[PDB]
Design an enzyme around this catalytic site. Structure first.
Site, short mmCIF file in Angstrom:
data_model
loop_
_atom_site.label_atom_id
_atom_site.label_comp_id
_atom_site.label_asym_id
_atom_site.label_seq_id
_atom_site.Cartn_x
_atom_site.Cartn_y
_atom_site.Cartn_z
N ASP A 44 0.84 -1.18 0.00
CA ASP A 44 0.00 0.00 0.00
C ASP A 44 0.86 1.22 0.00
O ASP A 44 1.60 1.42 0.94
CB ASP A 44 -0.90 0.06 1.23
CG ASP A 44 -1.72 1.40 1.32
OD1 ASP A 44 -1.19 2.42 1.85
OD2 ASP A 44 -2.89 1.39 0.82
N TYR A 49 3.64 9.82 -0.45
CA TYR A 49 4.75 9.20 0.34
C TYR A 49 6.08 9.33 -0.39
O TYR A 49 7.13 8.98 0.17
CB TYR A 49 4.52 7.70 0.62
CG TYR A 49 3.17 7.32 1.18
CD1 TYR A 49 2.41 8.21 1.90
CD2 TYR A 49 2.68 6.02 1.01
CE1 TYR A 49 1.18 7.84 2.40
CE2 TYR A 49 1.45 5.64 1.52
CZ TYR A 49 0.70 6.56 2.21
OH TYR A 49 -0.54 6.21 2.71
N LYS A 74 -2.57 6.14 -4.46
CA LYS A 74 -3.55 7.14 -4.12
C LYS A 74 -3.28 8.51 -4.78
O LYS A 74 -2.13 8.91 -4.91
CB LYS A 74 -3.56 7.35 -2.60
CG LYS A 74 -3.50 6.10 -1.73
CD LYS A 74 -3.61 6.38 -0.22
CE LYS A 74 -3.44 5.12 0.61
NZ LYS A 74 -2.02 4.62 0.54
N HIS A 107 -7.17 10.08 -1.71
CA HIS A 107 -6.44 10.07 -0.44
C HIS A 107 -7.16 10.81 0.68
O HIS A 107 -7.21 10.32 1.82
CB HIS A 107 -5.08 10.67 -0.63
CG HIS A 107 -4.05 10.16 0.35
ND1 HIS A 107 -2.77 10.04 0.03
CD2 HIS A 107 -4.16 9.71 1.65
CE1 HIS A 107 -2.10 9.55 1.05
NE2 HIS A 107 -2.95 9.35 2.04
N1 LIG Z 1 -1.46 6.95 4.55
C1 LIG Z 1 -1.60 8.15 5.31
C2 LIG Z 1 -0.82 9.27 4.59
C3 LIG Z 1 -0.56 10.52 5.41
C4 LIG Z 1 -0.68 11.73 4.57
O1 LIG Z 1 -1.80 12.03 4.15
O2 LIG Z 1 0.35 12.32 4.32
C5 LIG Z 1 -3.08 8.50 5.50
O3 LIG Z 1 -3.92 8.62 4.60
O4 LIG Z 1 -3.50 8.63 6.63
#
Ligand SMILES: N[C@@H](CCC(=O)O)C(=O)O
Length: 277
Positions: A44, A49, A74, A107
């Site tokens: 994932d 990231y 995402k 996201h």
């Molecule tokens: N995988 C994390 C990423 C953090 C972020 O948005 O930078 C989330 O969606 O919580």
């Protein structure tokens, strides 16, 4: 091992590696390779990231055939909107070195652009470039709003979910609209870690000769939630996968369920949208 079935019949492996917080290049490629070596078949990741290259490297290095692995990534907040989202998909695809991506998510919802963004995900799905489409950090109201304006409804919602924040409302909302939940949590990279440090998890971990983290993961599994524990450490990565040789009892499950405090620890979807444009 265990899979969860999405509303289009695609089977999504129930345990995956989160590479959130992994530095690009070696750190990730190692994490991903180690995971695949250990048996993980689900990685994932996310544009934001900044480690899609590394993920692709790890996958190619592992030597495991592409179709045996599931890759989620995402669309970041700043790339929301129809054409922008379409473009971010390609940037991600090229960076992963992939002909297709198994799952692509929004996201964060935001407020103004997510319906438009979802239209792009529908396209990519019609073009057979993704095998499933879904969202992340969506709340029921977002989902209810999105439902008014879509042809294909979301298949996954990846959200904060752990024993102190059990998301009962959303879980029921998702049970009812045929959506699989994926759990993330502010653990694995060594945050405060209050989630894991309590007598219920401790004594269940001790009873089964496992760690509290292995227990939470198993608890996720037996609730039918998809789980993506993140770590860059070879040993921890291996430990998180060694959750198939034990079962939590019905009573142990009620006991962990009792820990719910509706205590959110990460960012609130209603008031969090860095990069929004
Ligand atoms: N995988 C994390 C990423 C953090 C972020 O948005 O930078 C989330 O969606 O919580």
């Amino acid at each position: 091992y265990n899979c969860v079935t999405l509303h289009n019949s695609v089977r999504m492996p129930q345990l995956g590696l989160g590479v959130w917080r992994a530095q690009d290049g070696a750190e990730t490629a190692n994490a991903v390779r180690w995971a695949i070596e250990a048996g993980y078949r689900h990685i994932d990741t996310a544009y934001i990231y900044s480690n899609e290259r590394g993920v692709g490297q790890g996958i190619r290095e592992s030597g495991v055939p592409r179709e045996e692995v599931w890759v989620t990534t995402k669309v970041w907040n700043s790339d929301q909107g129809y054409e922008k989202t379409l473009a971010a998909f390609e940037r991600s695809r090229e960076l992963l070195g992939l002909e297709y991506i198994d799952l692509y998510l929004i996201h964060w919802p935001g407020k103004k652009k997510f319906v438009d963004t979802w239209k792009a995900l529908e396209k990519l799905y019609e073009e057979k470039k993704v095998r499933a489409i879904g969202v992340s950090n969506f709340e029921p109201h977002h989902l209810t709003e999105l439902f008014k304006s879509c042809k294909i409804r979301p298949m996954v919602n990846q959200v904060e979910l752990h024993p102190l924040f059990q998301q009962r409302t959303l879980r029921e909302f998702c049970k009812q609209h045929n959506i699989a939940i994926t759990a993330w949590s502010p653990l694995g990279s060594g945050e405060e870690a209050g989630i894991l440090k309590n007598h219920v998890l401790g004594e269940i971990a001790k009873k089964h000769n496992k760690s509290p983290a292995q227990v939470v993961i198993r608890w996720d599994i037996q609730h039918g939630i998809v789980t993506i524990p993140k770590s860059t450490n070879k040993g921890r990565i291996q430990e998180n996968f060694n959750v198939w040789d034990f079962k939590l009892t019905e009573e142990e499950m009620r006991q962990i369920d009792e820990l719910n405090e509706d205590k959110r620890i990460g960012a609130d979807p209603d008031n969090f949208f860095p990069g929004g444009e």
